[PDB]
Structure 1
Amino acid sequence: MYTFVVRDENSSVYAEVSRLLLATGQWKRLRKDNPRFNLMLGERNRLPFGRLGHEPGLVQLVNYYRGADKLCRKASLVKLIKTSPELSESCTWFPESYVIYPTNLTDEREVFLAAYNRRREGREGNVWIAKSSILISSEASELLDFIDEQGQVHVIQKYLEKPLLLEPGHRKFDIRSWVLVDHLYNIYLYREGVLRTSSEPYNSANFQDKTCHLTNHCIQKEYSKNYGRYEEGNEMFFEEFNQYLMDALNTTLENSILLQIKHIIRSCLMCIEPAISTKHLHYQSFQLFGFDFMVDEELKVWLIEVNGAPACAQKLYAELCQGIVDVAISSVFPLAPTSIFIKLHHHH
């Protein structure tokens, strides 16, 4: 009889995993503070990694990688890419970014302005976006002043002015990929992604109205008037998107986009493996990641960010959560296909 504890009541993903675990009849849920557990579904913030793996005879597993925050933080990701030789400052799939600390608090203000002034002089498009852990503008003055009005670290990265627009609609979108890393650091890409589409026509001459520029599911369902017009819940899945790429662009989702997505996932996760691997640790970790990508009109894939506590598409909860149990939990605590994941092989 295996034992687990639930320490994040707000996780829709691991509420289903917990539901599945109990349904097997071979897992028992303890009080959240009971130290005699095999599996911890930990809290998002300040997870007590230091107390794991010190119960005699208990093989203990947790659903988060200590140190994975370096990848799942706005400013942290930028610093990681610029300072890690595996990714380098010339990384071709990450938008030119800069970490800007508000003046009321290293910082990259002067470096940003230098590159900003260069684009302005060369007639090039100079539209940046400021965000933290949102404002879109082409004037450096407005971007820096907006950050000083806040008190948290922000990042300024280039705004993809030439995004791939779906038709009909002429509308922006982004691609969410769910990736699972087990205790052995196998990288599993869920076969099912989701396109979070904008239900408004993309307008390049008005960044003030952010409805057609931000493809967040919450913004479209609150400030967009065409929500659900083209696809239910502004969510297009790979089957429809692949069929579209073939009909419109005479190409496939695997060739035009997925190869780059798999390459980006591997690069990011392999880069931090020595820092977060639990191979020789007194406890074991796995974690579910949400990678967000942008695709431009040239079919080049750009990484936008990585989410360390992602939610899932309503239609895909059952399949993904069961997969988490099969490859992440039961592989360590076996019970008494055609896998839904794509293993991204790599050198350890």
Structure 2
Amino acid sequence: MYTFVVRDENSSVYAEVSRLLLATGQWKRLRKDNPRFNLMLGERNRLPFGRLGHEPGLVQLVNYYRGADKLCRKASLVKLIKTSPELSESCTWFPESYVIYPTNLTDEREVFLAAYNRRREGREGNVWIAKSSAGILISSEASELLDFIDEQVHVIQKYLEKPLLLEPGHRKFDIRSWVLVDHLYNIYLYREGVLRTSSEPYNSADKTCHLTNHCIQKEYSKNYGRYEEGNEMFFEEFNQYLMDALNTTLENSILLQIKHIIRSCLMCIEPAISTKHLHYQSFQLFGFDFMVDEELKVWLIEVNGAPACAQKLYAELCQGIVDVAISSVFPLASIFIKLHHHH
């Protein structure tokens, strides 16, 4: 009989994990402020890691990696990629980004304008995007981007002006992959991803066809749900499209780059978040987001620390979380692809 607490009610993923643990008959849920737990489904903000691992006779486990926000914040991800030698200043799979602080507050304003003038001097695609962790503007003029941020920390990166467009539709999309890292820092990639597609035709010259967010496609888009159900294309249908249209497969053309990016990001921060010799153990489910261009090259957009799964994949993924991340520590009485690496 194991015990666990719940400190995040808004978690749609671990609400199902908490439901499955109780269904096994070998897990008993406690109050959210009870310290005698084996597992903590902690909160997003200000998780008390300092109080974990100090209960005698209790192996404690938490569903978040302390220090993983270095990878799941817009400003932190750009700073991590430029400064880490493992990722280097020259990164092929990450769009050229810059950290810009508002003028009412290090900053990279003078460095961002240097590469912008190079793209103005030589006739190239000079369309950028501004965003933050908290409102997005896509303007080819640097003055409209800088004036917009001044109106919290933001990041400006190169906007992929030649994205891979699905037919019929001639539309943008992005790929969400769910990655689970257990206490042993094994990297498991869920075999099932989703293509969050746009329903409007991509117009290179209104931010509906340019943004593939689910909330924007359900409110501002007009052809929502026309081509695929809920603007979500799974890997089986997408693999068939690549074979019919581009004479290639999802594994070779895209999935190899995706698995390479996931390994590089997590191996980089491994010495800083690893709970290998720590008094408590940590696992965490991640949501990697990718953009594919017409050259079939995969780019990393952002990483999510508290991701929400797809509706069809909740049952299978949450069951896989219990198997390799929970029952591997607390045994009772594969849907993942392991990404091997040198620990």
Q: Same fold by TM (over 0.5)?
A: yes
Query: CA shift at 1:79, angstroms?
Result: 0.1
Task: Report how far residue 212 of structure 1 moved.
Answer: 0.2
In the TM superposition, what is the alpha-carbon distance from 1:327 to its structure 2 partner?
0.2
Distance of 2:147 and 2:58 partners within structure 1? 53
Q: CA RMSD of the aligned region, Å?
A: 0.2
Rounded to whole Å, the distance in 2 between the matches of 1:11 and 1:237 is: 23
Q: Name 1:90's counterpart in structure 2.
A: 90
- Distance of 2:237 and 2:70 partners within structure 1: 34
Cα drift, residue 157 of structure 1: 0.1
Candidates 219, 223, 240, aligned match of 2:237: 240
> Displacement, 1:57?
0.5
Offset at residue 14 of structure 1 (A): 0.2
Q: CA deviation at 1:288?
A: 0.2
Report the alpha carbon displacement of residue 82 of structure 1 after superposing the two structures with TM: 0.1
Note the residue ranges of structure 1 that are not aligned, 5 or more in a row.
none
C-alpha distance after superposition, 1:134-166 (max 9, x if no partner):
0000000000000000xx000000000000000
CA deviation string 1:223-273 (max 9, x = no partner) = 000000000000000000000000000000000000000000000000000
Query: Using the alignment, how far apart are the partners of 2:121 and 2:72 within structure 1?
Result: 34
Deviations 1:181-227 (A, max 9, x none): 0000000000000000000000001xxx1000000011000100000
Match of 1:80 in 2: 80
Shift of 1:324: 0.1
User: Separation in 1 of the partners of 2:54 and 2:180?
Assistant: 26
* SS in structure 2 of the partner of residue 195 of structure 1: strand
Q: How many residues align?
A: 341
Q: Match of 1:77, SS?
A: helix
Match of 2:62 in 1: 62
How far apart in 2 are the matches of 1:196 and 1:114? 34
Residue 50 of structure 1 deviates from its aligned partner by 0.1
Counterpart residue number, 2:108: 108
Provide the rounded CA distance (Å) in 1 between the counterparts of 2:93 and 2:316. 30
1:346 aligns with 2:338: no
* 1:136 match: secondary structure: coil
Partner of 2:269, secondary structure, is helix
**Cα displacement string for residues 98-121 of structure 1 (whole angstroms, at most 9, x for unaligned residues):** 000000001000000000000011
- Hey, what's the Cα distance between the residues in 2 that align with 1:220 and 1:322? 29
C-alpha separation between the residues in 2 aligned to 1:254 and 1:308?
A: 25
CA distance in structure 1 between the partners assigned to 2:272 and 2:138 by the alignment: 34
Per the alignment, residue 167 of structure 1 pairs with 167
Residue 66 of structure 1 and its aligned partner are, at CA, apart by: 0.1
Task: State the distance in 2 between where 1:41 and 1:279 align.
Answer: 20
Give the Cα–Cα distance (whole angstroms) in 1 for the partners of residues 257 and 219 of structure 2: 32
SS of the counterpart of 1:135? coil
Please state whether the residue corresponding to 2:138 is helix, strand or coil: strand
- In the alignment, the residues of structure 2 paired with residue 322 and residue 225 of structure 1 have an alpha-carbon distance, to the nearest angstrom, of 36
Post-superposition CA distance 1:27-58 (Å, at most 9, x none) = 00000000000000000000000000000110
Q: CA deviation at 1:15?
A: 0.2
Instruction: State the 1:179 CA deviation.
Output: 0.1
Offset, 1:22: 0.1
Q: What whole-Å deviation, never above 9, does each CA across 1:64-99 have from its counterpart, x for those lacking one?
A: 000000000000000000000000010100000000
Q: Residues 1-21 of structure 1, C-alpha deviation per residue, up to 9 Å, x if partnerless?
A: 100000000000000000000
Partners of 2:89 and 2:308 in 1: CA distance: 30
- CA deviations 1:279-332 (Å, max 9, x no partner) are 000000000000000000000000000000000000000000000000000000
Q: Match for 1:145 among 147, 161, 164?
A: 147
**Distance (whole Å) between structure 1 residues aligned to residue 139 and residue 177 of structure 2:** 28
1:226 aligns with 2:227: no
Q: Distance in 2 between matches of 1:347 and 1:79?
A: 24
2:183 partner SS: coil
In 2, Cα distance between the equivalents of 1:153 and 1:328? 34
Provide the rounded CA distance (Å) in 2 between the counterparts of 1:178 and 1:210.
Answer: 26
Question: Tell me, what secondary structure is at the counterpart of 1:137?
Answer: coil
Matched-pair identity in %:
100
2:167 is paired with a residue of what secondary structure? coil
**1:123-134 residue pairs with structure 2 within 5 A?**
123-133=123-133, 134=136
Partner Cα distance (1:19, 1:4) in 2? 12
SS at match of 2:179: strand
CA distance in 2, matches of 1:123, 1:107: 27
